[PDB]
Write a protein that binds this ligand. Sequence first.
Ligand SMILES: Nc1nc2c(ncn2[C@@H]2O[C@H](COP(=O)(O)OP(=O)(O)NP(=O)(O)O)[C@@H](O)[C@H]2O)c(=O)[nH]1
Ligand SMILES: [Cl-]
Ligand SMILES: [Cl-]
Ligand SMILES: [Cl-]
Ligand SMILES: [Mg+2]
Lengths: 168, 77
Amino acid sequence: GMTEYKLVVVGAGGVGKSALTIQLIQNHFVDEYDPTIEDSYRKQVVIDGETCLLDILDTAGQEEYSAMRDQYMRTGEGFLCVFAINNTKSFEDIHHYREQIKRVKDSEDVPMVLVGNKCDLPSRTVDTKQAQDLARSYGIPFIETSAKTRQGVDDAFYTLVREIRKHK
Amino acid sequence: SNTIRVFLPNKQRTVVNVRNGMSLHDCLMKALKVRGLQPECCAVFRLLHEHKGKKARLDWNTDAASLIGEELQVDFL
Ligand SMILES: Nc1nc2c(ncn2[C@@H]2O[C@H](COP(=O)(O)OP(=O)(O)NP(=O)(O)O)[C@@H](O)[C@H]2O)c(=O)[nH]1
Ligand SMILES: [Cl-]
Ligand SMILES: [Cl-]
Ligand SMILES: [Cl-]
Ligand SMILES: [Mg+2]
């Protein structure tokens, strides 16, 4: 890719950051839960007619490894802020992750997309209105995803790239 | 807990968990496959703690449990 974009995936443990990333990179769903300490990926993709080199920085949800997360966040240009639609604390903690981004980037003006993952599950407990209101409160897009079915995966990452372009 | 840090081709990085009975090949297979990397095309080295000696070329059958706490480099052959 000519244009390189540094994308950071953040959010609470277990919400599906790595499964989303692996669906983007390799079109495969991981059903195991292997907690991340640090993982980075490169993927070339055409987005809006531009050949893009995406650096995907997939971070730990476990706060024990937040020092490593912060090193990845400092290099990133845009952030996928992921919660799971069956974990209300992960949704509430989007505020924590946004505050971390503001702290590490020393800026309140950072490209961000809200992602509500695991939408294939039954008995969803974080409803669409809650999620859209939270995204609205920060002026950011909200994308529903399922890493299992691949629904929304490209839209989530491509929307973040578009947000970075807007910001540039 | 029991992990290995691995520097990968194309500026990528992973930290892998080690489970009982894993060779180095087994331990890195997922991380390589997701990134389109075939282990047969790669060299793996154990990075040292001092600069006097040479980084140690590893066999794919090295037991991953013997490498816990180390940093490795995977490079294209
Ligand atoms: N049904 C379903 N399961 C999912 C989905 N995304 C992830 N999972 C499952 O949820 C578990 C955790 O996924 P994972 O991607 O490891 O989450 P993570 O946010 O990267 N965890 P960590 O912060 O520890 O690195 C795995 O068992 C995975 O299969 C999804 O969209 N639907
Ligand atoms: Cl291409
Ligand atoms: Cl750490
Ligand atoms: Cl808005
Ligand atoms: Mg993960």
